Design a protein around this nucleic acid. Sequence first.
DNA 1: CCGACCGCGCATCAGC
DNA 2: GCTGATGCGC
DNA 3: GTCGG
Length: 326
Amino acid sequence: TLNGGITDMLTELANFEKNVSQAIHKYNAYRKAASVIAKYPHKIKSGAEAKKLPGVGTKIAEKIDEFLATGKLRKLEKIRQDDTSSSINFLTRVSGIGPSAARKFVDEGIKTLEDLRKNEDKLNHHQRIGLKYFGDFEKRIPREEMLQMQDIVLNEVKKVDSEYIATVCGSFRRGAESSGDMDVLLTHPSFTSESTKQPKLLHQVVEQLQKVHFITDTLSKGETKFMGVCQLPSKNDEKEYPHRRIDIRLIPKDQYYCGVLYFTGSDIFNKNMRAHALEKGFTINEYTIRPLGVTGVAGEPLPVDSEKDIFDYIQWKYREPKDRSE
DNA sequence: CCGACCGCGCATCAGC
DNA sequence: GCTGATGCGC
DNA sequence: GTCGG
Ligand code: NA
Ligand code: NA
């Protein structure tokens, strides 16, 4: 909102480095810079001002100076005037098409969605799904739809086995008004980190979701992770809902509530909580919470039966998901 | 100055 | 056919 | 590209 001109620039630069330069760490630098400036409560007036922010160094400082004087960035103007870079960049918007595949397609003249449709033969299964749902995957999901989608997932999971537990996480669980996909964490009493005593725990749930025609396509599926496509049923009279990306992860039950914690976020809240654990003698990753020895050695994972248990261990007032922005 | 920069499940490829 | 590396999205 | 050891 407040510095959107700069942050659009920094994001554009980020996409370039990831997709064209294949410089993943520059991409994440530019993103880090863009997030920190999006959070800044004043109109940036100089590159020096921004440089005080963590993640803005000397090069982004001068790019801001240029952007403020001229309103554009010549480096970005050249990049956009270059047919190759813009086609590689554009093609990475197809899910399953990354910097490698996008580069290769462009090298042999496949540069547009239409070009991809002509050469569907040359796409893997994931890429074909990405092409089919190209528009729908770039749409947001309003929360009311999210709420409907959750009702379906939780009802259908329960139909396979009442002993399943399923949680939709992400920004949605924090009460976000819109989401980018649906992220479901699944667990069962028979699946602990010490033994698997059920063969097809995730399969049974994806299969039930398919048979009620909620899950429509599969991008990838194994014993513990499903990535696919779903759609809310259309109400006979009205327009169809866009197809939506959904992930479902089967997590061992002794690690489930640490998983919920980590995948609920936010990322800034995770890292402030991971930092406070350390100060009080514990380390938390996405799987466990462990005490630290006097010399920095992690002990065994502590029992966790709810989220608040993790809070109890590190002597933190419980934080409801809606209050975990920072 | 110099290396770290999230780590991992799955699909596919590369090399055998 | 096998095992390990790579691409990819998260 | 930025940071911190
Ligand atoms: Na800085
Ligand atoms: Na892509």
